[PDB]
Amino acid sequence: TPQNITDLCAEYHNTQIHTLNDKIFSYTESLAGKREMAIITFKNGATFQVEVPGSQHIDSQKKAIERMKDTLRIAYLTEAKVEKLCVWNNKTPHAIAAISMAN
C-alpha cells in the first residue's frame, strides 16, 4: 500500500503528478444530463476534471468520485493549499485520481 500520493500515482498507467502548491482558483459543478461532473482550475491556467462516472470506474470508485467532489468544493472555499494532484493524462482535461493538501 502506498504511503503518499506520488507512490500511489506510480502504481497506475497513464498518470502523472502535477505539483501546484496553490489554492484552487475556480470550482465548477454541473448536474446536466451526462455532464454530472466538476472542473477545477488553478491561477496558472491549469484545468482538471472529476469525471462523469462510467464503466471506466469500478463500483468502489463510485463513492470515491462523490467524496472527491465534496472535497474539491470545500477545498476551494476553504482556500486550502493543494500540494499535488495525481491525474489521468489520457483525458482532456486531465482527470483527477488523487489529491494531497499540505502547507
Binding site: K62, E66, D70, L77, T78
Partner: protein, 208 residues
C-alpha cells in the same frame, strides 16, 4: 506571515467567544479613533507583549483580572502611524488598529493577568494558523482613504491623502463612514467564508 500582536482587555475569553471576537465600544473613523482604545469602529493592539502589558498596567490598573490577547496579523489591520502620518496624534503608541475589531478566529490565545502579574498561555480553538499566517497587515495605501480627517483638515490637500480623498473631502464624513462600512463588510465576508467553509467540510454526499 505569522507575526503576532497583543491587546490588554478586561473582557474575558467567554465574552470574547460570545461576541465573536474583540469588538469596538457604529461610527468607523481612524482619526477619531486614535484621538484600551476601542472607540469609533477600531480596536487597538500593540506590537509586543511587554507593550500591551504596560498599557494594561496603567489603563486597567483597577481590575483584579484582565487579559492580554495574542492576535494574528490580517488585512483588517492598519499601522496607525503610516495611515495618519504626521497627524498621528499618539504616535508613541506604535499602534496597529483593527477596523471593526478582531474576529475570534484571528485570536491565537490569551494570557491571564491577575493583580498586575502576568501568568501560562491559553490557545484558542477558533484560531486558524495556516490562514492567518499567510496574511499580513493592510498596506497603508488601503487606509489613506479611511483616515477620516475632517473635510477642512490640511491632510486631504497634502500627499498622500490628496489622491485618496473621499468625495466632499478637501458629506465627507458621510463618505468616510460608508467606505469603512463597505471595507468591514467585505473583510468579514472573507473570514466567514474561511470559518464556515471549514464548518461544512464534514458533508458527505454519498452516505445519504
Amino acid at each position: 506571515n505569522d507575526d503576532k500582536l497583543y491587546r490588554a482587555d478586561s473582557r474575558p475569553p467567554d465574552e470574547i467567544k460570545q461576541s465573536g471576537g474583540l469588538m469596538p465600544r457604529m461610527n468607523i473613523n481612524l482619526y477619531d479613533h486614535a484621538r484600551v482604545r476601542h472607540d469609533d469602529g477600531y480596536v487597538s493592539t500593540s506590537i509586543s507583549l511587554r507593550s500591551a502589558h504596560l498599557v494594561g498596567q496603567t489603563i486597567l490598573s483597577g481590575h483584579s483580572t484582565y487579559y492580554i490577547y495574542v492576535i494574528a496579523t490580517a488585512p483588517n489591520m492598519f499601522n496607525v502611524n503610516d495611515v495618519l502620518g504626521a497627524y498621528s496624534p499618539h504616535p508613541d503608541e506604535q499602534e496597529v488598529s483593527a477596523l471593526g475589531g478582531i474576529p475570534y478566529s484571528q485570536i491565537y490565545g490569551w494570557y491571564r493577568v491577575h493583580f498586575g502579574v502576568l501568568d501560562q498561555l491559553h490557545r484558542n480553538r477558533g484560531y486558524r494558523d495556516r490562514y492567518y499566517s499567510n496574511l499580513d497587515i493592510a498596506p497603508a495605501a488601503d487606509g489613506y482613504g479611511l483616515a477620516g480627517f475632517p473635510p477642512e483638515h490640511r491632510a486631504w490637500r497634502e500627499e498622500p491623502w490628496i489622491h485618496h480623498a473621499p468625495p466632499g473631502c478637501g458629506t465627507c464624513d458621510e463618505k468616510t463612514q460608508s467606505l469603512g462600512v463597505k471595507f468591514l463588510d467585505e473583510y468579514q465576508s472573507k473570514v466567514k467564508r474561511q470559518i464556515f467553509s471549514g464548518y461544512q467540510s464534514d458533508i458527505d454526499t454519498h452516505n445519504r
